[PDB]
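Re: [help] complex structure
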Amino acid sequence: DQLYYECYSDVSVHEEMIADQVRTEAYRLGILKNWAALRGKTVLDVGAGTGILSIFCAQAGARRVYAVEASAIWQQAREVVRLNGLEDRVHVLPGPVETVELPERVDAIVSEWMGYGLLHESMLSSVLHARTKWLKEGGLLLPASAELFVAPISDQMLEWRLGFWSQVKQHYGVDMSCMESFATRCLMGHSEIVVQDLSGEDVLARPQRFAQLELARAGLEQELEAGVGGRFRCSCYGSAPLHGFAVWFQVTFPKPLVLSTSPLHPATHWKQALLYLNEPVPVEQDTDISGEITLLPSPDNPRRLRILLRYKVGDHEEKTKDFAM
Amino acid sequence: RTKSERDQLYYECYSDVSVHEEMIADQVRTEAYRLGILKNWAALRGKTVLDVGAGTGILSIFCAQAGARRVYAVEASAIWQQAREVVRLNGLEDRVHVLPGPVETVELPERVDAIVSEWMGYGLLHESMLSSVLHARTKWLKEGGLLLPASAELFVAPISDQMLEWRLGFWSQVKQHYGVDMSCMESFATRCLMGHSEIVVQDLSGEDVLARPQRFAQLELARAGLEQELEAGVGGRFRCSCYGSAPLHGFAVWFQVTFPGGDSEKPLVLSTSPLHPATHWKQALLYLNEPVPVEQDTDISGEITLLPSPDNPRRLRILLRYKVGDHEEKTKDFAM
Ligand SMILES: NC(=[NH2+])NCCC[C@H]1O[C@@H](n2cnc3c(N)ncnc32)[C@H](O)[C@@H]1O
Ligand SMILES: NC(=[NH2+])NCCC[C@H]1O[C@@H](n2cnc3c(N)ncnc32)[C@H](O)[C@@H]1O
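Output below.
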């Protein structure tokens, strides 16, 4: 745990998260749009960082915010709260949320806990521990749920990198087309999850929701250990080389506001989690693709995301690939 | 990591496509070698060439296209098998010979007329590949032979880094967009972003340059005894006067290499300066612990030494000694 917390003692990660305008505006609005449910109520900010989300909760009308932060950045949060004149009702409490002592259970929890592929970092378990210990019955969760999506992809950037070697002749007068098979093995033949941003034109079929996480659900923490995911089925839009699948998520706040990391929506720092096949597979309009995706903690490191992929393209035999972040 | 582990990582890196894609996609770099080689056709026609660390073989092929009779393309990582295919694909395997393994233990049939190599790393000497080129020169280059490029030059300039300024000022600008005052974090951000002792590789522009760049070292690859200068430290002293008022953030170090042949007084130069087109080498930034205000005609002097790290000969270390105006001389010790 200590190694993890120390990653957040440096300014850069916090600058990156606030500079993610889609992320930060969405949390801001998700909180402020809940003013009626927060007015005069108490809030626990799990992993409060610099404190910015706790101050949004105060602007929404919370009577008190407990801002709990395990890394050294809590000292900066204390100063931010003081600078904004909110030390009377926003209280920064250092340490893990699992052992912090609050004066009272709270009406609401706010937290930005999502990692790459949703569950990389595994910070959800700390939010669920706080829910069990400190959230009043039926309390407000900001956000309250996460939804997981998959779509087959033809990655235009990958195509360009594989095709790069056949363009060397035009650039420098040396033919290097024979490098394409080697490049394919290098860029696709591995078993790592690739975090990369796609565009709408990389999506080869209607995205499918394959799992939903309800943060209030008691027993969710046990589900995370066993893996979360599910089956999916789709049919391709048209002819292209299938490179694999993109996985992304959205979270929904108590119309409810949705923060999405879909390639069809404005870019975020999460991008998408790309699962490449070992080599491209030609697909056509109406080619059926079915499969199953499971998000699991790595055996060597619970905080490291693993994804089991099972898939069937058209008539081909079912195949499997086991990815890790 | 142990030496065994460092060697394995190096092998894995250059056995993989990504680094070679980056180098070849670096058009300034690759065009400079193509033209610099072709401009030496008169010295290369009918002669033999050793390409130290040939990679995919593209530079060896440039040498064949310039008229070389025979090219030995020596490559230690698994990419040598890709280079063999590339050479065959272009119909050149009967005089471009891809040879696997370290140049330090390869066997050639004779000493060669010329050596070509793209050996430069970040801050010129990060990765420390020059030593292999010099080993090949001593062992395989004929007396009075040709080196391509023939020399490298190191430059320094004081900088006011506009990107760093933006990152340091980020916290003071949060409130005007999100309604939360975070100005109090500027000191913390400064400690995090400047108080470290890491060399930062980043692209600068001419706007960031606070004074006329100063050349502070030159490496003549033909010089016997250059290998001994590498271990003792490469560098030199500098002085400059600031263009105007701005916060001094530290210094940028960059290099160029010069190809022989052509105009004896205007050789072909591959530059990584912020004043010239971008390359994958960017520049090596040496940040002071905190910004220092300077004015027009503020004098800045000091000394810069590039050394291999004691824990890892492939890891660049830079010792900076510097004096700003009337302030006392200061020192800072950076590592890549
Ligand atoms: N969205 C993410 N991928 N990560 C969000 C991390 C936000 C903050 O939560 C802090 N943090 C993480 N786990 C804990 C914990 N159990 N208790 C308290 N603070 C924590 C961490 O130090 C950081 O400052
Ligand atoms: N400009 C740089 N910063 N590095 C250029 C490295 C180019 C190629 O030289 C190869 N290489 C490195 N050292 C050696 C050596 N001693 N002998 C042979 N090949 C080598 C390495 O495997 C790579 O494929």
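The longest strand of chain A covers residues 240-252.
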